[PDB]
Amino acid sequence: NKQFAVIGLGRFGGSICKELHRMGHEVLAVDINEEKVNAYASYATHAVIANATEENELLSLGIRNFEYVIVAIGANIQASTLTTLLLKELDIPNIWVKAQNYYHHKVLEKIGADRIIHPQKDMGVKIAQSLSDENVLNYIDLSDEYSIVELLATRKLDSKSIIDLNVRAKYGCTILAIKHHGDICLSPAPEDIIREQDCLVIMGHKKDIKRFENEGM
Amino acid sequence: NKQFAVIGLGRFGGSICKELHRMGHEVLAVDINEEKVNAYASYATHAVIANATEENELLSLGIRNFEYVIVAIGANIQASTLTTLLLKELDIPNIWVKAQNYYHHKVLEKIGADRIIHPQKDMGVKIAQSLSDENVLNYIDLSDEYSIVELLATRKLDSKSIIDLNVRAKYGCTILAIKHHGDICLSPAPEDIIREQDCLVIMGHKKDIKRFENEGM
Amino acid sequence: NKQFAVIGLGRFGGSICKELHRMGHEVLAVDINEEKVNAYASYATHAVIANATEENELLSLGIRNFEYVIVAIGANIQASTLTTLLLKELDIPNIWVKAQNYYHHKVLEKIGADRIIHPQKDMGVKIAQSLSDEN
Amino acid sequence: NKQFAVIGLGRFGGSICKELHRMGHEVLAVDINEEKVNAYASYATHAVIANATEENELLSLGIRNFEYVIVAIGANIQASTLTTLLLKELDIPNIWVKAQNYYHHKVLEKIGADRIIHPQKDMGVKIAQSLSDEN
Amino acid sequence: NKQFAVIGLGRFGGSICKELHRMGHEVLAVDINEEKVNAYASYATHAVIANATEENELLSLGIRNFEYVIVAIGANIQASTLTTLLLKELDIPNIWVKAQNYYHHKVLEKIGADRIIHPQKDMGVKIAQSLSDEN
Amino acid sequence: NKQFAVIGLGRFGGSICKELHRMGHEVLAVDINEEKVNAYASYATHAVIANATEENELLSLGIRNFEYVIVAIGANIQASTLTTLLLKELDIPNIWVKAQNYYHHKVLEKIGADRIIHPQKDMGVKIAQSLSDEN
Amino acid sequence: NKQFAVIGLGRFGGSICKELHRMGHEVLAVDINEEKVNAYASYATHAVIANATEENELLSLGIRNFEYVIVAIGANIQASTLTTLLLKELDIPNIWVKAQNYYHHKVLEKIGADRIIHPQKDMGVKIAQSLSDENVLNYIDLSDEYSIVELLATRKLDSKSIIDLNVRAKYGCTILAIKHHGDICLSPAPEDIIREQDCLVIMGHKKDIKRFENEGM
Amino acid sequence: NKQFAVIGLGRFGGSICKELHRMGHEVLAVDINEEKVNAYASYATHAVIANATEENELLSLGIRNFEYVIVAIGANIQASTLTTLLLKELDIPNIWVKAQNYYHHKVLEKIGADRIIHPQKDMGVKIAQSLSDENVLNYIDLSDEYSIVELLATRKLDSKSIIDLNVRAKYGCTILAIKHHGDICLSPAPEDIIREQDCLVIMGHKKDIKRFENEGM
Numbered sequence A, B, G, H: 001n002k003q004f005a006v007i008g009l010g011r012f013g014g015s016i017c018k019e020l021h022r023m024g025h026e027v028l029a030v031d032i033n034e035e036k037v038n039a040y041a042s043y044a045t046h047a048v049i050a051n052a053t054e055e056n057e058l059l060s061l062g063i064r065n066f067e068y069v070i071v072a073i074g075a076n077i078q079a080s081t082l083t084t085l086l087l088k089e090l091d092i093p094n095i096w097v098k099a100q101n102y103y104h105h106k107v108l109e110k111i112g113a114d115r116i117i118h119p120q121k122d123m124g125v126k127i128a129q130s131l132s133d134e135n136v137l138n139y140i141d142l143s144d145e146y147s148i149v150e151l152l153a154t155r156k157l158d159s160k161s162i163i164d165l166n167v168r169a170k171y172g173c174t175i176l177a178i179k180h181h182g183d184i185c186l187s188p189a190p191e192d193i194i195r196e197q198d199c200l201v202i203m204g205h206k207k208d209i210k211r212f213e214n215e216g217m
Numbered sequence C, D, E, F: 001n002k003q004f005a006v007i008g009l010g011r012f013g014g015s016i017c018k019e020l021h022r023m024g025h026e027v028l029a030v031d032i033n034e035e036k037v038n039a040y041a042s043y044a045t046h047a048v049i050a051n052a053t054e055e056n057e058l059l060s061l062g063i064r065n066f067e068y069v070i071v072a073i074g075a076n077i078q079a080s081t082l083t084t085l086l087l088k089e090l091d092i093p094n095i096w097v098k099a100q101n102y103y104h105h106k107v108l109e110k111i112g113a114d115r116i117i118h119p120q121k122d123m124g125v126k127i128a129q130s131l132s133d134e135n
């Protein structure tokens, strides 16, 4: 199918490998720690003990073969950098590397990493958003002003109809989906009911959605 | 407004504090490392050097007053645990704690943490998804089967109309938004054009969207 | 007869193991320190070197079989806690744990220890009783 | 009534002092750690900050007057030994000392401790008894 | 004449600065260690305390003006790399960097160092030559 | 031909050993770090793991036989000094030692090193010469 | 002859063992460090690796047999104390122990050490004496006021006769010995010559000897 | 008077400083350990916290002024050596240094130490001598063969006269002093009595004195 190499079986890397394997892709799980290799042996096609900074070992893995190589080492800067460098000289098409700090990001950038990821930082932003605002479950920003938001229904919204909550006119926003007890209703008709604790998917302007949150729920 | 305490100014915690401060909330940034306190001094209301495991220091902070306290210590299990326990005994309403592994999650759960977060793991799942599928830019899962997906337009979609790409009947999915050169089109009419490299927002069943990705783009 | 597991062969744990062995019960003496295992080899049925916080080692001991498991680690809070949690998830009937301080007691309590003991403290109470009353 | 000196306000020593105080005996609570003195101030007749290994401080306490002196220092062997020694040379009638291990027990024995206690070991025996017999 | 910037006043860098100064070139001696700046104050045109990894400080030095910049930091790999990088993005014509090991050489190479020097290795070759031939 | 001993397989020492071996001289490569010995195994006649400060090991190497011994340890002053002293007492004809700073140079001088080298410093002089004069 | 056990082959203990062996006495050199046993193997009757704090090893040495046992462990207080204790319970006649500090001295005293020695302290006193007074080579105090002193002859005393330096009347002191180029003259007659740099042995009152040092040499 | 610097307030150095101070000399007590400085504050003219290996601190002490500087650091070879070298370059007249082993002695020698002392070794020799021979209390060697010895009187010597014990003819040795109950008799006449447990001071050849010990006492 497509070949993936996950170097460094941390929480982040390990999650990558496990999830990728669940999708049924060819995933090579590489780690210097034997116990890590033993741990993710069930969740990969091939799990190998290797020092990714050692070139001959990298050739012994046959890493040149892979379309995507992921350096999920984000604590040991030298290891990460060196590995990424090795992969670059070996003409790997896509090199995605986990970064620790802004400067590690810089060195990864300059030695030609294709994509650099900061997991804890970004998730930090997200959880912070959820922190200042206990309401929102999830969201995606379409632009600086417009956004699609996933909301947890409160005791203002139980047994209320879509026509009752006229968001399309009163607030200029549109409801896209309702999730009730795992069951899912896409682009629901105005007769449909929202029960409390259900997932509600609204779409519109940020300030408008906030308005609806305030007076509506 | 509402009072927030961020204990542990790492990447995750630090991001929390910085972002929260950008929203204009009262954020107390607490850390045992002096340099961390000095670093986030600009991005908080009050930045204090404190050992969060030391109770008298915790009273010196006056943490009982705060609605939300965040333990963003995820490397030092003992520190995190001890701190969370301290906060619980001090009757803090909402305690959100960063966890490292499944068992640290367990002990946090058992000592009554209100919300436990695994940043690297979750972000790992996400980036893994982006890894197996170079196309998807972003997404949100409405349920186990249904999802809203943001897609990067290829040359197969250039100069194509919404009515030309009949997703609502042929694939059972619905287009929600088109982002062209930063400009944004919400719930676009069938006459609208999609140019390549633009952001496309489709909504529907996972496999159906996959199907559309396959034959359409 | 009845199966007992004593994890942590200190003075306290070691005393438990030695005494129980004197009563003729099946006692598994577990310790990470090799010299401890060697020391109480005579005073147990089976004495094993194991890291009780490592799950696979805990399965290698076959601890699920035991009716009573005693965590006599009272200096290393993290070890004690982690181990107790491991035993709880492994559905051990009776988990008795040695505690150091009030908060270690709290975390043991919350992760569902069946009995928590403070040996030195209680002994303080006892010796005080003996002091007030020489009889 | 009878005068007791408790040197070292740990869990064990602290328990001794607190309990003896509940039974209404004259108990002098001595500790080098100020916060310990502050903690047991409510549970003693006189609570003093003192380095029990320093002789002049021991004379400043007026320890020669006391019938019973209890050395509840069981982590710091040197401190325990030295203190016990000071008390012995000062002709104290009854010196009861908390011991850590068999050899600290030995040195306490040889410098003439009147009663040596091993809290964790003995309590180990007890809790083991409680284990074999849930009643 | 020609402008030289020597970042890192070690033995190697310091020698560069001192000697260049003896030949009468405009040499800016930069160091984070104040005492190093004080030491080579006599042997430079301008000696400045600066963190060469901090960009705003690098602009405060006005390093863009210089034809040659020498990174004589060879113990602190991160500092060396970061500084060299800063200089590269600032379009410096000639960047000569002291390297520690083969891989630091590699990263310097990839971030586009113009000349990389290994003092101990090369000098090793030389002294070896002097050994085989005493003349 | 002529026998050379290179103690300390760094970049500098390693360079000496490698180059000398390329010239086809009998070179004994000695290092306390096993991986170093393994690294320069191809570039020497005999590569041995040895603690050069330990005299009996130095006799086990049979270092008295060698005309030239090179101490290429320039980070660990104590090791360098102690080794040089050992070699001097063992009546080695030519002892060339890598030095770190002026005082290490002084102590090497006083314990009678035959030649003291400062590689990085001198290299500083050289690169400065090359900078002033691009030709 | 007489049997000696030297436990702990340090500089002090090692010197004891070596010197004792030079006198031709039966010396058992005991140490836990193998290399120490190997080092003093030539300078003892029997050199054994043993943990002197372990009782069964002490019986394996047969230490009960020895008239004198010397604990020359002065860094490791616990080891020293414990060993001394072991020897005491085993009814060793003479136990001489090296001490580190005043309190280690105390515990050794109370567990019944027969002789306690402080080498560095005493030698410290001596070298200090030599420090304030560059003249005196050696001495022995007969009492608070009276002493026998060994002096290094200066350029005041060369080619001077004993009758010339009338110490017995002018200073009340008496010359006992003259050491010239290793050759030795005991209780010398008044005709004898003292050459410079020779050893001179005077006897008398301290202040008087000082007087002679001042005006005489 | 004369100025002394004692660097390193150990047992040896500390004893030096204390004793020197008792003699009423100007003694500068230098140590890197603050508590050591605090301890010997009473027993010196000036007690200073200083790193003796740091040159600028050594100039801050003004050590160039002192006639005698003593390096009593004998555990930390590097510190001792570096310090001694510093003092030498600073043209100090007399540098006396405590040594640990033969090679530390060698390096001190080569960097031009004026006097090198081995306290534990020498005291070891002495105590060893007292060990093989329970009789000798003290002694001084005049040469390889001749010596002055202080002896503890046994019951064989009780109530015996100097003329009764004819050492001057029978053994070729001469009695110099008798110490009875603290009272002291210098160069005693032949009528004088020696009572047991008294101090006896004999002078002569080593083996001759040994002979007298054997048959006499």
Ligand SMILES: Nc1ncnc2c1ncn2[C@@H]1O[C@H](COP(=O)(O)OP(=O)(O)OP(=O)(O)O)[C@@H](O)[C@H]1O
Residues within 6 Å of the ligand: A007, A008, A009, A010, A011, A012, A013, A014, A030, A031, A032, A033, A036, A050, A051, A052, A053, A072, A073, A074, A075, A076, A079, B120, B121
């Ligand atoms: N040079 C190397 N070669 C191969 N594997 C390595 C190398 N260096 C580190 N690893 C492995 O990569 C993994 C990276 O995790 P690390 O300990 O760096 O923390 P992290 O990746 O930031 O945390 P996590 O990924 O668990 O959130 C480690 O488990 C480690 O065993």
Ligand SMILES: Nc1ncnc2c1ncn2[C@@H]1O[C@H](COP(=O)(O)OP(=O)(O)OP(=O)(O)O)[C@@H](O)[C@H]1O
Residues within 6 Å of the ligand: A120, A121, B007, B008, B009, B010, B011, B012, B013, B014, B030, B031, B032, B033, B036, B050, B051, B052, B053, B072, B073, B074, B075, B076, B079
């Ligand atoms: N006992 C403690 N009391 C107060 N602060 C602490 C304590 N222990 C750690 N911290 C601080 O909390 C922060 C937590 O970051 P840590 O070094 O644990 O990595 P992390 O938080 O897992 O990673 P990230 O930087 O992504 O958050 C650190 O900056 C540390 O200084």
Ligand SMILES: Nc1ncnc2c1ncn2[C@@H]1O[C@H](COP(=O)(O)OP(=O)(O)OP(=O)(O)O)[C@@H](O)[C@H]1O
Residues within 6 Å of the ligand: C007, C008, C009, C010, C011, C012, C013, C014, C030, C031, C032, C033, C036, C050, C051, C052, C053, C072, C073, C074, C075, C076, C079, C080, D120, D121
């Ligand atoms: N993680 C662990 N796994 C296995 N054994 C352990 C672990 N931690 C400690 N132990 C062992 O448990 C024993 C407990 O003794 P410890 O040193 O904790 O003193 P204590 O238990 O507080 O007091 P006592 O010695 O009277 O029991 C020790 O001998 C130690 O070797």
Ligand SMILES: Nc1ncnc2c1ncn2[C@@H]1O[C@H](COP(=O)(O)OP(=O)(O)OP(=O)(O)O)[C@@H](O)[C@H]1O
Residues within 6 Å of the ligand: C120, C121, D007, D008, D009, D010, D011, D012, D013, D030, D031, D032, D033, D036, D050, D051, D052, D053, D072, D073, D074, D075, D076, D079, D080
């Ligand atoms: N030399 C000393 N002089 C006076 N007090 C001391 C001295 N050394 C220790 N202490 C005090 O005596 C107390 C003895 O407790 P320690 O820390 O020795 O543990 P412990 O007593 O064995 O534990 P527990 O709390 O179970 O009794 C301590 O609180 C300490 O402050």
Ligand SMILES: Nc1ncnc2c1ncn2[C@@H]1O[C@H](COP(=O)(O)OP(=O)(O)OP(=O)(O)O)[C@@H](O)[C@H]1O
Residues within 6 Å of the ligand: E007, E008, E009, E010, E011, E012, E013, E030, E031, E032, E033, E036, E050, E051, E052, E053, E072, E073, E074, E075, E076, E079, E080, F120, F121
């Ligand atoms: N980030 C930095 N910014 C500015 N100056 C630095 C930085 N890092 C190190 N320096 C300075 O540069 C100098 C480089 O010397 P360093 O300590 O790295 O040893 P070196 O240069 O390899 O040794 P040598 O003296 O042989 O050159 C040091 O004096 C240090 O103070």
Ligand SMILES: Nc1ncnc2c1ncn2[C@@H]1O[C@H](COP(=O)(O)OP(=O)(O)OP(=O)(O)O)[C@@H](O)[C@H]1O
Residues within 6 Å of the ligand: E120, E121, F007, F008, F009, F010, F011, F012, F013, F014, F030, F031, F032, F033, F036, F050, F051, F052, F053, F072, F073, F074, F075, F076, F079, F080
């Ligand atoms: N006491 C010792 N005995 C034997 N080998 C040693 C000893 N000390 C250091 N070495 C070895 O000598 C080599 C010297 O390299 P070091 O790490 O000292 O850098 P350097 O010599 O200053 O610079 P370079 O690496 O360029 O020679 C090291 O590889 C080290 O393993």
Ligand SMILES: Nc1ncnc2c1ncn2[C@@H]1O[C@H](COP(=O)(O)OP(=O)(O)OP(=O)(O)O)[C@@H](O)[C@H]1O
Residues within 6 Å of the ligand: G007, G008, G009, G010, G011, G012, G013, G014, G030, G031, G032, G033, G036, G050, G051, G052, G053, G072, G073, G074, G075, G076, G079, H120, H121
């Ligand atoms: N428990 C023990 N059993 C046997 N030998 C021991 C024991 N502990 C220490 N030793 C040995 O006794 C010797 C005592 O020397 P230590 O290291 O204590 O310094 P020291 O005796 O004060 O110094 P020195 O005697 O060299 O002047 C050491 O060489 C050590 O190997």
Ligand SMILES: Nc1ncnc2c1ncn2[C@@H]1O[C@H](COP(=O)(O)OP(=O)(O)OP(=O)(O)O)[C@@H](O)[C@H]1O
Residues within 6 Å of the ligand: G120, G121, H007, H008, H009, H010, H011, H012, H013, H014, H030, H031, H032, H033, H036, H050, H051, H052, H053, H072, H073, H074, H075, H076, H079
């Ligand atoms: N670099 C240094 N600069 C200044 N003082 C030092 C330095 N290193 C050690 N000292 C001090 O010198 C003293 C030397 O004693 P050390 O601990 O070396 O044992 P020692 O002198 O061999 O034993 P003793 O107590 O018998 O003299 C110590 O008290 C220490 O604090």
